[PDB]
Design a protein around this ligand. Structure first.
Ligand code: SF4
Ligand code: SF4
Ligand code: FES
Ligand code: FES
Ligand SMILES: [K+]
Ligand SMILES: [Zn+2]
Lengths: 183, 160, 124, 70, 696, 112
């Protein structure tokens, strides 16, 4: 993946941008803390970061500072957690994250063809974003769905047993505005 | 011949030995050593083998410059050999070689550091000149000049 | 003015004169180190009383020459490799990171490397 | 002997078989600074090299100032 | 609890739970290490200390593996030799070839341990190249070259646990993991610069010291620090006439391998604003003069004003050596004068702690007993800024035990948890009578610490009365073995000046309008009266407000240029060692007074340093016992505390303000330091600015 | 021991009546974890209060008049250093080396 260990202030991502959990996420965050002992409430950083990431769209520096202040922890401790796990998107990202597995079990059944077909359709190389901020192609490791090796992931949904002609249809569905059937 | 060193055991040469023990015998020996040295030089030219010229140990011998500028370990060894030097195990030695003047020996004392603790230099000329009184007594003044010359005296060696 | 001749500055506020013997270098007026003794002060010694200052060794300032070299811009790579452009006759090979949005010089040669994507930002 | 240019000093001493005027363009030295006429040894003249310290003094004295008491 | 183990056939015995690497050191067996430090938490991320347990098929890290009874440890088998070469090769795989341009060259642990335990040749010929890491900006003190880091986490462990600054950590995963602060900010800690010493490689280096020297050039002198009253032991490195850098040296009783950023980075002020020549004022300008002319002018100026008994005033600064204090006192005494004091602004003419009893103004518990403290009370003090090393020691005890620290006075940013009570004597009275005073009474080894800024407030008398009454009325504070009363000074000359009685206990004397003022390094004289017609002589090593207020200036030597005696806050006598000579025609400070004495008709009987030091014994017998604290006996200590109990004295309820305003500007050397100027601009006066405004 | 061996050593009288030697054991450097240099006792001389170092004006060289400035003797034991200093009739003083207090260190303490 794209691993950078240094944050650079941007108009899209800088600590000045205010962030706060909505009144819906304020209540649901309290249940998360209740799943941990009171003297070890620092173990809820991971769910809180994802809660903010889904609300805002990505794990901005404002979200990391907000979680640090919420749990009475130094900001650097939250920075270590967010930068260690690859599912914390420290950049705006697109509406649908395209995750293509390239590991050996998936590579045997033609995962290379899946990557080739998508690159020439969306016209974005892996790690890039479509101009309309709709798609995001990402190269990912094993996701566990290796028995159905030609497998891809869009946001939170899996898509197994694919072919290059099938992957275009899935992209066409999201481009049009229709959710393809996952399976 | 008594304690061969540095490939002197792989060349053939002879030693001239006098009988009367005077200057003329020593002149003849030094002329034979001239031809025997030329005999050895010819063998070294023919029998020069390939291979490294220094020990393949970068903790004592400096690494090559090209390897120094490309290898991390070579740079470290180059840096430390020129700034701190190499440590020598503690102990002492008395190493002697057949110097052209005679027997030249060094008594080096090591303390486990990178600097010798003591370095006694044994000079054959220093010992030769100490016998000048015993040898030149009764001779005439021009004979002393010959005796000084026949001892092959260099006073840097004597006064090291 | 004797203030530009005795103070270390990043740049000379005027154009150096190659025929002026009070400059630190023929191509640079001011010294380039805080501990570098000014040439004008050094030449004001009893040993220069009857000595011609023109024939004294006056090598060119290396700080002004190195910054006349254009920045090397690297395409499709965030790491620059420099070994002195001579190989075995250069300097030890080092790798320079180019992630930051600025030119970063070599630790030995002083040649500055940067990415081509930052070319517009650096030049302005 | 010092009047011989450093280019031809090496050739005279049998250090090489290629004179500096026969040098390949890649074998020549590249100077970013201008080149002047050869200057021989300047001893026994007024142009002799005069050594000097290139470093400033290691301690700077205090610049005195007077402040009036209230 | 001892366990008899074996290390390469050597019997060892240490406490249960000790690491193998600790037992190996006790047995004389050396094990290479990068990530292990005897003052940090245990990490096993470097794998250089691997040893072979006798009956086990796995190699154990000796820094983390606990010791067992009957355990036999091998440390020099060919299997371990393979491991050391293999780990060394991995460390040097991506390391940059930077030794010539790297300031750690001659003192690099990576170089020495790779030479000693690694192979002589490398095998990395990859054309893809090494890893490249950008350099982080964390302020003007720590220079970063992160290509050279070996990911050993010494800096992370120290700054989080010892220094208490959690803004430094490890961000990333795998080969892309980078040490730093992630965001663009600086490290805010008075002990941050100790990270430079702990970093075994050139990744973290001193920025002021960068490129200026190699360790083999420097000469090492074991002297003491005078920038605070702790007397931290330091190793001053010199290259001929100039001091290059200051490093800490081990002393578990005083500083424990740590020094503050003020101590090690103020050495560059020794080259700026120095007093090198005698100066004589002529109107509004100072002109140079000879020593004979300067001393004659003082004698001529002495007879111009004709001062009487108490019209001769002597003031001693924070950096004044003890030999000069006694010499100035005796010269003052020979002139029939007793008006001697320090440049402080104590409200009461006799300080509330007084000078009759040593126990009233020293750290009676000693710094090394903080490891045993159960309860600590801070009365109007800021240990983080006044005693940076001592503050870190309290945090270490706080982390590893249930020690509770209560604070009375002005709140401050602390490295531990403070149970704040109030900001006046009224809260202290409530605390010592309430639950807070019950904890101290029930504590087995309680501690009470009074700040040096208490005597500079209008409630100085009340604070020492409240504590003394509580101390005398409770039998556990003062015992034959324990003494819980402590005073934390911030100047290295206070305890030495008080041990010799260089203070006026007579209010009438201190109110005299002086005609001849002798400033011996005194510079905080804005609030101390100086008559416009008075004749002022300043003796010191830096030109400052004291020099500007003088008429004749006598240049002296600094603490690095003289063998001088300093008594720290715990009553420990320590002697400096001269590393260089004073610049110009500056002289030793005690010789200037002796030479001037002959010009005033009061020739002192001192001729050499030994005679001067013999005078110290006459003034106080404990001043010739170096590195030894002479404690006050239990019976005498109670009388001194009882003398502080003064009934019929009111409490004004004023704030116990912290004495230090700017951490980097506390004396002449620090003010003259260009590095401290950069620290104020970047870190701030209170070290509170997280963003560097002078770094681009 | 009691013999005044300085009467026959040939050294100048200034070594006795004007110079002070320090018997010390080298402290561990704060920048390195090695302790090899701390295993031996050494003797050096205190600097001259004047003339220890001064700057030569021609080239900036470090001029000196102290002939003992670069002499550092090495001893294996403290008693040997004292016996030699007493034998030569030197004015000396001993700096006792600082000993590190032993504290147990285990990985379990990182959580307990
Ligand atoms: S840290 Fe050590 S090995 Fe690395 S470049 Fe510096 S001196 Fe060389
Ligand atoms: S920067 Fe230095 S101290 Fe910190 S982990 Fe790297 S090598 Fe260790
Ligand atoms: S190998 Fe691709 S999902 Fe497991
Ligand atoms: S010293 Fe034990 S693994 Fe680092
Ligand atoms: K370091
Ligand atoms: Zn280069």
């Amino acid at each position: 993946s794209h691993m950078i260990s240094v944050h650079r202030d941007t108009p899209k991502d800088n600590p000045e941008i205010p962030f706060e959990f909505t009144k819906e996420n304020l209540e649901r965050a309290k249940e998360i803390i209740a799943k941990y002992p009171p003297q070890y409430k620092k173990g809820a950083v991971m769910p809180l970061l994802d809660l903010g990431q889904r609300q805002l769209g990505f794990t901005s520096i404002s979200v990391m500072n907000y979680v640090a202040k919420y749990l009475d922890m130094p900001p650097m401790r939250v920075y270590e957690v967010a930068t260690f796990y690859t599912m914390y998107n420290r950049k705006p990202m697109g509406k649908y994250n395209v995750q293509v597995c390239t590991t050996t079990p998936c590579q045997l059944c033609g995962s290379d063809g899946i990557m080739k077909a998508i690159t020439e359709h969306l016209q974005i190389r892996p790690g890039q974003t479509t101009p309309d901020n709709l798609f995001t192609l990402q190269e990912v490791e094993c996701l566990g769905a290796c028995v159905n090796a030609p497998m891809i992931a869009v946001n939170d949904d899996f898509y197994e047993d694919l072919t290059p002609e099938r992957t275009v249809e899935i992209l066409k569905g999201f481009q049009s505005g229709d959710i393809p059937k996952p399976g | 011949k008594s304690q061969p060193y540095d490939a002197y055991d792989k060349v053939d040469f002879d030693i001239a030995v006098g009988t009367k023990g005077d200057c003329y015998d020593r002149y003849l020996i030094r002329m034979t050593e001239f031809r025997q040295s030329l005999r050895i030089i010819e063998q070294c030219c023919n029998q020069m083998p390939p291979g490294p010229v220094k020990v393949e140990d970068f903790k004592v011998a400096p690494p090559p410059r090209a390897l120094m500028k490309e290898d991390m370990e070579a740079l470290i060894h180059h840096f430390l050999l020129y700034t701190k030097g190499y440590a020598v195990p503690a102990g002492e030695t008395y190493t002697a070689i057949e110097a052209p003047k005679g027997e030249m020996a060094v008594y080096v004392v090591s303390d486990g550091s990178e600097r010798p603790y003591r370095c006694k230099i044994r000079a054959p000329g220093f010992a030769h000149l100490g016998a000048f009184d015993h040898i030149a007594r009764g001779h005439f003044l021009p004979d002393a000049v010959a005796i000084i010359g026949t001892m092959d005296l260099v006073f840097g060696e004597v006064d090291r | 003015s004797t203030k530009e001749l005795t103070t270390a500055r990043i740049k000379d506020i005027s154009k150096p004169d190659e025929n002026n013997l009070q400059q630190q270098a023929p191509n640079r007026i001011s010294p380039w180190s805080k501990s570098q003794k000014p040439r004008a002060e050094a030449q004001d010694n009893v040993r220069f009383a009857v000595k011609d200052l023109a024939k004294q060794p006056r090598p060119y300032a290396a700080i002004d020459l190195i910054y006349k070299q254009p920045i090397r811009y690297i395409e499709h790579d965030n790491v620059a490799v420099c070994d002195g452009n001579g190989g075995a006759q250069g300097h030890p090979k080092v790798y320079i990171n180019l992630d930051q949005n600025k030119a970063i010089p070599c630790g030995y040669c002083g040649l500055r490397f940067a990415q081509a994507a930052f070319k517009e930002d650096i030049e302005s | 002997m010092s009047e011989v240019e450093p280019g031809w000093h090496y050739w005279l001493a049998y250090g090489t078989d290629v004179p500096p005027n026969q040098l390949k363009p890649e074998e020549k030295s590249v100077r970013a600074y201008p080149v002047k006429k050869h200057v021989p040894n300047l001893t026994y003249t007024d142009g002799a090299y005069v050594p000097y310290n290139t470093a400033r003094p290691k301690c700077a004295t205090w610049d005195p100032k007077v402040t009036e008491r209230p | 609890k001892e366990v008899e183990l074996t290390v390469d056939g050597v019997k060892v015995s240490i406490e249960a739970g000790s690491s193998i690497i600790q037992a190996a050191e006790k047995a004389g067996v050396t094990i290479p290490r990068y990530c292990y430090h005897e003052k940090l938490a245990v990490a096993g991320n470097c794998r250089m200390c691997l040893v072979e347990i006798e009956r086990s098929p796995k190699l154990a890290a000796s820094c983390a593996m606990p010791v067992q009874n009957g355990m036999s440890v091998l440390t020099n088998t060919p299997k371990i030799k393979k491991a050391r070469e293999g780990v060394t090769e991995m460390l040097l795989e991506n390391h940059p070839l930077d030794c010539p341009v790297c300031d750690q060259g001659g003192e690099c642990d990576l170089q020495e341990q790779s030479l000693r335990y690694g192979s002589d040749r490398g095998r990395f010929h990859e054309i893809v190249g090494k890893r490249a890491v950008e350099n982080k900006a964390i302020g003007p003190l720590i220079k970063t070259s992160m290509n050279r880091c070996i990911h050993c986490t010494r800096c992370v462990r120290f700054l989080n646990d010892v220094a208490g600054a959690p803004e430094f950590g490890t961000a990333g995963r795998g080969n892309d993991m980078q040490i730093g602060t992630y965001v663009e900010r600086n490290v805010n800690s008075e002990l941050s610069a100790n990270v430079i010493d702990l970093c075994p490689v050139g990744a973290l280096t001193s920025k002021p010291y960068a490129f200026r020297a190699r360790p083999w050039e420097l000469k090492r002198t074991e002297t003491i620090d005078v920038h605070d009253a702790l007397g931290s032991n330091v190793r001053v490195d010199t290259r001929g006439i100039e001091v290059m850098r200051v490093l800490p040296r081990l002393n578990d009783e005083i500083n424990e391998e740590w020094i503050s950023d003020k101590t090690r980075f103020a050495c560059d002020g020794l080259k700026t604003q120095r007093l090198t020549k005698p100066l004589i004022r002529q109107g509004n300008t100072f002109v140079d003069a000879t020593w004979e002319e300067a001393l004659a002018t003082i004698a001529e100026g002495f007879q111009k004003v004709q001062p009487k008994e108490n019209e001769i005033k002597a003031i001693v600064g924070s950096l004044t050596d003890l030999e000069s204090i006694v010499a100035l006192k005796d010269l003052v005494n020979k002139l029939g004068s007793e008006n001697v004091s320090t440049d402080g602004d104590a409200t009461t003419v006799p300080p509330a702690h007084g000078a009759d009893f040593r126990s009233n103004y020293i750290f009676n518990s000693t710094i090394d007993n903080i490891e045993e403290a159960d309860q600590i009370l801070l009365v109007g003090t800021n240990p983080r800024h006044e005693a940076a090393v001592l503050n870190a020691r309290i945090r270490k005890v706080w982390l590893r035990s249930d020690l509770e620290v209560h604070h009375v006075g002005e709140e401050f940013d602390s490295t531990f948890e403070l149970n704040h009570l109030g900001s006046d004597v009224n809260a202290l009275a409530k605390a010592l009578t309430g639950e807070v005073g019950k904890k101290l009474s029930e504590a087995s080894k309680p501690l009470i610490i009074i700040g040096s800024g208490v005597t500079e407030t209008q409630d100085a008398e009340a604070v020492y009365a409240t504590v003394a009454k509580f101390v005398t009325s409770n039998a556990n504070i003062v015992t034959p073995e324990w003494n819980g009363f402590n005073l934390l000074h911030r100047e290295a000359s206070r305890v030495g000046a008080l041990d010799v009685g260089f203070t006026t206990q007579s209010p009438e004397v201190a109110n005299t309008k002086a005609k001849f003022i002798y400033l011996l390094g005194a510079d905080e004289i804005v609030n101390k009266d100086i008559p416009k017609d008075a004749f002022v002589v300043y003796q010191g090593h830096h030109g400052d407000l004291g020099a500007s207020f003088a008429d004749v200036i006598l240049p002296g030597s600094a603490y690095t240029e003289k063998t001088a005696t300093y008594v720290n806050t715990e009553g420990r006598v320590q002697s400096t060692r001269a590393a260089t000579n004073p610049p110009g025609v500056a002289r030793e400070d005690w010789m200037i007074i002796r030479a001037l004495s002959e010009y005033l008709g009061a020739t002192l009987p001192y001729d050499n340093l030994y005679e001067m030091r013999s005078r110290l014994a006459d003034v106080a017998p404990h001043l010739l016992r170096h590195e030894v604290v002479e404690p006050v006996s239990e019976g005498i200590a109670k009388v001194g505390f009882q003398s502080l109990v003064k009934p019929g004295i009111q409490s004004k309820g004023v704030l116990l303000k912290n004495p230090i305003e700017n951490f980097y500007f506390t004396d002449v050397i620090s003010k003259s330091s260009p590095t401290m100027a950069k620290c104020v601009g970047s870190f701030g006066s209170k070290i509170e600015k997280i963003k560097d405004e002078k770094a681009n | 021991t009691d013999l005044a061996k300085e009467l026959v050593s040939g050294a100048p009288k200034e070594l006795i009546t004007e110079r002070v030697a320090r018997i010390y054991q080298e402290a561990k450097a704060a920048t390195q974890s090695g302790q090899h240099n701390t295993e031996t006792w050494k003797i050096d001389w205190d600097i001259l209060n004047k003339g220890n170092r001064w700057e030569n004006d021609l080239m900036g060289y470090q001029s000196s008049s102290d002939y003992m400035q670069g002499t550092i003797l090495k001893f294996d034991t403290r008693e040997g250093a004292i016996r030699f200093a007493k034998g030569q009739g030197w004015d000396y003083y001993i700096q006792e080396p600082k000993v590190r207090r032993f504290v147990k260190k285990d990985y379990s303490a990182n959580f307990y």
